[PDB]
Amino acid sequence: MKEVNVRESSQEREQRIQQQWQKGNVFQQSVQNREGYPSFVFYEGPPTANGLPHVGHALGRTIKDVVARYKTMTGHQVIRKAGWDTHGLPVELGVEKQLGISGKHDIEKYGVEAFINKCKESVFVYEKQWRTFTEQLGYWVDMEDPYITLENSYIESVWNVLGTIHDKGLLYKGHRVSPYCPSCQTSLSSHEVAQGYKDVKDLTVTVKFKVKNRDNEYFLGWTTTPWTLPSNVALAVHEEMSYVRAEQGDSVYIVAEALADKVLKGEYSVLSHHKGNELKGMSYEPPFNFVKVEKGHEVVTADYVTDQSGTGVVHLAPAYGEDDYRVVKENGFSFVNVVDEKGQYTSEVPPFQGRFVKDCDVDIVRYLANQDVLYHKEKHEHSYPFCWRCDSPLLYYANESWFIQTTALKEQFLKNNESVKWYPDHIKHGRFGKFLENMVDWNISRKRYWGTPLNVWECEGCQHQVAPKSIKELQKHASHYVDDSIELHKPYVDDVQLTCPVCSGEMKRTPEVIDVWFDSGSMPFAQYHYPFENSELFQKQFPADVIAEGIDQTRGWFYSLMAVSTLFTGKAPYKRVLSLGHVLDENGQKMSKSKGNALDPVDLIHTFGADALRWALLADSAPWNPKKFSERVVQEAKSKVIDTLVNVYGFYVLYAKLDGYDPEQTYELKKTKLDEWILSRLHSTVKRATVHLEDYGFTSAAREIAVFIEELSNWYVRRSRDRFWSEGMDGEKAAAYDTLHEVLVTLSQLLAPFTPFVADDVHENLTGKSVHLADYPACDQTKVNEKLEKEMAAVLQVVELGRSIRNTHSLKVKQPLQSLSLVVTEEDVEWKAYRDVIKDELNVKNFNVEQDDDKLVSYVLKLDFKQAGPKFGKQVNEVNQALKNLSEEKGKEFVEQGKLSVTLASGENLTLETEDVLVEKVPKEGFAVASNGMYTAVLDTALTEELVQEGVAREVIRAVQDYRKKLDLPVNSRINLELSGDEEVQKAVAKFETLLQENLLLHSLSVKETIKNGETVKVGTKQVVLRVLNQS
Ligand SMILES: CC[C@H](C)[C@H](N)C(=O)NS(=O)(=O)NC[C@H]1O[C@@H](n2cnc3c(N)ncnc32)[C@H](O)[C@@H]1O
Ligand SMILES: [Zn+2]
Ligand SMILES: [Zn+2]
To answer: GO CC annotation: what is one (predicted)?
Structure first.
C-alpha cells in the first residue's frame, strides 16, 4: 500500500482515480469480466443536447450508476451504451434564438441545410459538455460509442419501425382537430400537451342569436371561446332536452328549461316548452357576418349537450373543436376556417385580420355589445394547454396530420404496463396508468425541419403510399439513382421521388419530420441498428431489466418507449421503472437557468468531490418525491461521510507502515470485544445495505452505511488508537490492524456503487485490485453478534447521558468525578462487561448499577393552589410554607401514604388531600440526573480537593506530553523535567507523583521557583513554566 500523507484535495484524488480507470480500462473490464454471467439489461435514456447539465440531472445519472455498478458487483453483466437526443423542437428553438431568427418563414430564408448544419454544430457542443459532466460524476456509460438520434444508422432503424407500423395499417394521415402551437406552427402529441397545462382566467360569454323568420326571438348561445364566434356554423341542442321560449321585456329568448332561471335574471315569463328535436333546422343570424357559410347557421342535435352548464345551446365552430368538427361533418354543413398557421385572423375577418385570436377576446366582447347581441359574460378559471417548449398558448386547430394508431393496441398497452414493476408503486395506475386509460392516437407529424423525416411517399396520381424501411428499399423504389451515402434528413430525402407500383406516377415524400419522442422511444431497436445489424446482441439486450429517469418521462420517454415497442413488437420494452422526483432549489422552487437557481454540478464536483455530491443526492432524501437540494447538503456529506472515511483510511495506512503490519503475514490475534462489536456491525450493515439495495432503496442503504461509518470513527477507531500507537506487535495490536483492514476492504466494497472514487482509492491501495472489479461482499453471519450490538447500543446511550450531565453542570470530562450510578429497571445488559469503558469514557472512579433510585433521590413538597386554594382560604400560604419545611422522610412518607397532616404555628393540625400537594423528586445533595426513561444516569458532581488535584495532575501530564511533541524528542529518551508553578500546582504534582511518573518517561522531575528561558504553558486557569533537559 502507498501513503496518504501529502495533502490531496477531493478534486485531485478523483482526478488521480479517473486516470487510473483510463489506464486500466476498468469500466470496459468490469463488463468483459462478467461475460457468461447472467445479464442485467439497462437502457440509458438519452439526454437532450440543447443545454448545460444542472444538478437535477446528476440525480438520475447517479442512480443509474449505482444500479449498474451494484448489479455488476452481484454477478451480472451490465452493458451501458450512452445516447444523445438531438432532434426536434427542443433543439430547433434554441438554435433559432442563437441565429436571431424565428418561425418557419425565417428558416426558409436562412436555408434549410444551413439551419440544419447549425443544429448539428449546437448538439455537438452540448454533447461534449454532457460527456465531461458524466465522466466527472463517475457515471460509467459508453460515451465513446454512443447512440445518437441524428446518425444515419439510428434513423434507418426508426424508418424500419415506422415502415413496419405502416405495414399493419397503424400509420395513417387524417384531417383532424388537434392541439396546435401557433408559434412553433405545428400540431403536438397528447403526451406533449399533458406537459404544458397552466391555470388561466378568460371569458365565457352568452350571445343572442336572432331567429330568422321571427321577431324579437333570439337563441341564447354559449361559448367559452369568444374568438371562435366569427366562425360560427351551427348551434347545438340536445335532442331529448326540454327548452323554453321565455319572454323578457320586449324580447323572447330560447334557453334550456333547467337553466332559464339562471340565465334570465330580473324578470321573465315562460311561454311554451319545446324538445331539442323540435328546435332542429331553425335558422338564425350569426353574431358576425364577416365569413360566408354556404350550409349552416341552423340548429342541430348533438348528444353531448349538457344542461348542467351554459344555456343548453352551444355555439359550434367546426375548425376549432373536435366535437364541433364531428357534428358539422355529420349534418353536411360547410367547413370554414378563419385562422392562419400562426394563430392569426385571416382576411375573412377584416377588423381583426393579422391578430392572434386569443388576444382579441376583449375586443370581441365590445363588438358583441355593439351589435346588441351580447347577453352575459363571466370569468373562467380553468386549466389551459400551453406549448411545452415555447410557452405559447395552444389552439385546437383542424389540420392534416400523421398519426400512429395507438388506440388500436390500447388493451396491449395496459397489459404491458400491468407487467411493469414501478418505483414508486403509485405511478403504475396513477400518473402513467391514468394516461394510458385516456389514450388518443399519437400525432407524430411535425411541420418542421430538424428531425427524423417521416418515411412515407405518396403517389401524386393515385395517393398510394410507400414506406421504405431502409436505404436499400428507398433505392429500390426510386425513379432516379440514390447514392448509398444518402443522408436521412431534410432536404436530402425530399429530393428522392419514387415510382408508384400502382400507376407509375411520381411519389413524393410527405414533408414532415416526426415527434422527437418517437426517436428516443425507438432506442431499444435503433441503438444497435436492428434489424440490419447486431441481431443477437439486440436479443440479449431486450427487454430492459430497469430504466431510471425523471417523473416527467411518464408523459415522455416512459410512454414513447412503451408505445413504440407495443406497436412494433407487441411487447413491453422494460420490466421495471424508477420514476425520479425532480430536484428543486433550496427554497423548493423548480430549477432553471433563467431563474438562476440551477446549481452547476461541475462546480460542486470540483469543490466537494463527486463522491460527496452523489452521497448527498442519495442520502439526504428519497428520490421519488420532489427534492430540496443545496450546496450545504453536499458540504455535510463531504465532511461527515467522505472525509471521515479518508481519515480512518489514512490513519490505518500511516500506522500500518510505521508498525510494519502485513495482511499477507499471519499473526497471533488477541481479538477484543470492541473488535468483535465493530465486525458484527460491519456484517449487519452488509446484510441490511444489501436488502435495501435489492429493493432499490438507495436512501435506506446509504443511511445504514453512514451510521456504521460514524460508529467506526467516533467509537471503534477513537477508542482503539492506543493499540495502534503502542510499540511492539503484540496480539492485541495485530488484532486491531486485522480488524481495521477487514473493515476498510469490505466497507469500500459496500460503498463502490455509491462513492466510486474514494471506494477505489481505499480498495485498490489496500488490495492492489480495483473495487469495481470485485464482488459485493456477503454477510458473514458467524461474525454477527446480536447480543453484543444490543449492549453496546445501551452503553452508548449511557455514555451520552453521562456527557449530557457533565455539559449541563460545566464539569469538563478531564476533571474526574467520584461515581456514576445507573438505575436500570431490568437486568437486560451485562453491565459488568462495560464497567471499564463507562468509567474511562465518563472519567468516574465508580460505576454502580441500581435497581431503583431510593438511595439517590429525595422528595420536596409544595401546595397545588389551583386545587387547595378555597379549602384553606387565607391559610394557603401558611400551609404551603408548612409543606416546604418538612424533612426528607416526611416527603418520602407522603408519596407512599398519599395522606399528610401539617401542624401550623398555632398548633392547628390540618389534613392535606393527595391532589392538594405538588410532589417534586430531586436528586440527593451533590448529585445530578439525566434520564431517557429506559436508563437513568445519576452523576456525583461534588468536587473534593483530591479530585481537583488529580485533575490538575492530569492537565500537567497532558501539558508535558504536548511539549515533548513540540520539541521533536525521541519517544524512547528519558527527560529531566523542570516545572514551576504556584503552590496548588506544586501540591498536586507532589501528591500524584506516582501518576505523573507512570504516564511520563521522566528521568527526573524538579519543581523550581524560577526557570531560565522556560516555556510557559496553560494548565487550567494557571500558567506553568516547563523546561526539558536530556540525560547526559
Ligand atoms: C430520458 C430523456 C428524454 C428522452 C429526453 N431527451 C429528455 O428529457 N432529456 S433531458 O436532458 O431534458 N432530461 C435528462 C434526465 O433528467 C431528468 N430531469 C430533468 N430535469 C430534472 C430535474 N429538475 N430534476 C431531476 N431530474 C430532472 C429527466 O427526466 C431525464 O431523466
Ligand atoms: Zn411552441
Ligand atoms: Zn399511383
So the answer is: cytoplasm
- Experimentally, the structure was elucidated by X-ray
Closest by alpha carbon to 52, among 591, 795, 781, 782?
591
CB 142 within 8 A of CB 46: no
CA separation (Å) from 765 to 4, 10, 30, 131? 10, 17, 18, 28
Resolution in A: 2.2
Q: Can you give the CATH number for the domain in which 1019 is found? A: 3.30.2320
The tally of CA atoms less than 13 A away on the side-chain side of residue 34 is: 27
Domain match, 916 and 970 both = no
Residue 139 is placed in which grid cell? 457515471
Ligand 1 pocket test, candidate residues 54, 55, 57, most atoms within 8 A of CB: 57
Q: Please name the residue that has the C-alpha cell 386549466.
A: 383
Out of 552, 586, 600, mutate this one to test ligand 1's pocket (max ligand atoms within 8 Å of CB): namely 552
Domain that holds residue 665: 630-790
CA separation for the pair 125, 130 (Å, rounded): 9
**For strand 498-499 and strand 506-509, is the pairing parallel, antiparallel, or unpaired?**
antiparallel
Q: Do 917 and 958 have their domain in common?
A: no
End position of a domain, from candidates 368, 385, 402: 385
- With beta carbons less than 8 A apart as the criterion, state whether 838 and 799 touch: yes
- Do the beta carbons of residue 591 and residue 601 sit within 8 Å? no
| 762 and 903 inside one domain | no
Q: Which residues pair with 822 in a beta bridge?
A: 849, 937
**C-alpha distances out from residue 420 to 41, 413, 423, 435, 538, Å:** 15, 11, 10, 15, 20
Contacts of 411 (CB under 8 A, 6+ apart): none
Q: Which residues partner with 270 through β-bridges?
A: 246
Helix (H, G, I), strand (E, B) or coil at 242: strand
Residue 996, helix vs strand vs coil: helix
- Which is the catalytic residue, given 593, 812, 855, 966? 593
What gap in Å lies between CA 243 and CA 771, rounded to an integer? 80
In a domain, 87, yes or no: no
Cβ 709 vs Cβ 644: under 8 Å: yes
Q: Note if 517 is an active site residue.
A: yes
Does the residue 80 lie in any domain? no
Assess contact for 659 and 666: CB atoms under 8 A: no
> What is the rounded CA–CA span in Å between residue 369 and residue 376?
10
CA distance 516 to 79: 25
Of 497, 472, 517, 486, whose CA–CA distance to 160 is shortest? 472
Q: Give catalytic status of residue 557 as yes or no.
A: yes
**AA letter at 307:** D
Residue 672, judged by CB atoms within 10 A of its CB (0-12, 13-18, 19+), counts as middle
User: CA angle, corner 368, sides to 364 and 370, nearest 5?
Assistant: 115
Report how far residue 357's alpha carbon sits from residue 231's, in angstroms, rounded to the nearest whole number.
Answer: 12
CA of 465 to the centre of ligand 3 (A): 8
| 1007 grid coordinates | 519543581
3-state SS, residue 904: coil
Q: Using omega within 30 degrees of 0 as the cis cutoff, is the peptide bond preceding 146 cis?
A: no
Residues whose CB is less than 8 angstroms from the CB of residue 13 and which lie 6 or more positions away in sequence, other chains included: 609, 757, 758, 761
**Catalytic residue (choose from 21, 557, 715, 831):** 557
Active-site choice (120, 173, 590, 670) = 590
Dihedral sign (CA 553, 557, 558, 563): positive
- Tracing cell 488477541 back to the chain, one arrives at 670
Domain total of the chain: 5
Contact 192, 388 (CB under 8 A): yes
Q: Rounded to whole angstroms, what are the CA distances from 142 to 82, 309, 759, 811? A: 5, 58, 21, 60
> What residues are in contact with ligand 1 under a 6 Å CB criterion?
45-48, 56-57, 59-60, 85, 520, 549-550, 552-553, 556-557, 580, 582-583, 591
Measured between alpha carbons, how far is 472 from 355 in angstroms, rounded to an integer? 48
